[PDB]
Curated annotation (Swiss-Prot):
This is Pre-mRNA-processing factor 19. Its main location: nucleus. Ubiquitous. Weakly expressed in senescent cells of different tissue origins. Highly expressed in tumor cell lines. One of its GO terms (cellular component) is spindle. Keywords: Acetylation, Cytoplasm, Cytoskeleton, DNA damage, DNA repair, Lipid droplet, mRNA processing, mRNA splicing, Nucleus, Repeat, Spliceosome, Transferase, Ubl conjugation pathway, WD repeat. The lineage of its organism: Eukaryota, Metazoa, Chordata, Craniata, Vertebrata.
Amino acid sequence: PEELVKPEELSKYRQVASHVGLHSASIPGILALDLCPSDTNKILTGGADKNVVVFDKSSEQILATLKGHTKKVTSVVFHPSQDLVFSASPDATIRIWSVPNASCVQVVRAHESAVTGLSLHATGDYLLSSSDDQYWAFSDIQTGRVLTKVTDETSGCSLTCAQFHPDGLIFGTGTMDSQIKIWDLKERTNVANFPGHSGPITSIAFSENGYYLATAADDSSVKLWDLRKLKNFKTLQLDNNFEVKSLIFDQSGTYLALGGTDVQIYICKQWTEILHFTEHSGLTTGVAFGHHAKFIASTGMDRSLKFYSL
Ligand code: NA
Ligand code: NA
C-alpha cells in the first residue's frame, strides 16, 4: 500500500496532542479506546466516569457524551457506519448507541458478571463478548438478542478477553488460567487451545494477514502464533513489572502495538522495536493506529487521549 507510513518515517513520531477534557475531571481516567474503521479521525473512548465519548480529532470537538452505564466503561467498539458505537462494563451490560441521537438503543444482558471483551463481527451485524461469568456470547446488534451463549465445562473459568479473526469464522477468548481458547463460531466448538503463558491472559489481537495472533498475559510477554501451524514462533519478553493491557496490529499487518506500562510498536517483519512512548503518567489503557499508520493514538488513567505523528 503506497500510502502506508514506512518504519523510517514512523520512527520519528512524537506526541502532537494531548486532550484531557473528554471525560470527567472528578472521576479521572480513560479505560478504553477505538477508532472508527471508516474514518479514523472519529475516536471512541470509555471512561472511569461511566460515560462513552465520541470525539473528532480534526475539529477537536466532543460529538457525543453517552450516559447510561452504571459502572466504569472498560471496552468500546466503533462501527464502520459511523453512527453506531458499542460499549461494555463491569455493570455486566453491553450497550449499543446511536451517535446522532446520543442515545442507547439496546442494552444487551448476556452475562451475569463483568464483560471483559467485545468484538464486532466481519459482517458488522453481531457482537462477540467474553465475561468473568465464564461464557462467551454472540448477540444481534439490531435487536439486542443473545443468539448463542456458550462455556467450556472442562476449562470452566473466567474469560478475560475476546476477538474475532477477521474472516469471521473463528475467534479467540483469553482465560484467567493462561489459555487462549480458539472457537469455531458456526459449530460453537473449542477447536484449539494455546498454552504457554503464565498468569491471566490480558489481550489478544488477530492480524489482518489472517494467519498471525498476538497474545499477552501477566507473565509480561507477548506471544506470536502462526495459526497455520498452531505454534508460538516468537515471544517478546518484557520485564516482570511490565503490564501488557492492550495489543493491536495496524490495518496492513506491518506493525504491532502494545500498551499498558507504556506504549511500544514493533515491526512484524523483523520483530524490531520501532517506537516507544512514555508520555502517559500511570497505565496506558488503549492504543490504536490511524489509517495508513499516519498517526498513533493512546488513552491513559491520567485522563488523556494522546496522538503521535510527525
Ligand atoms: Na508480570
Ligand atoms: Na514520561
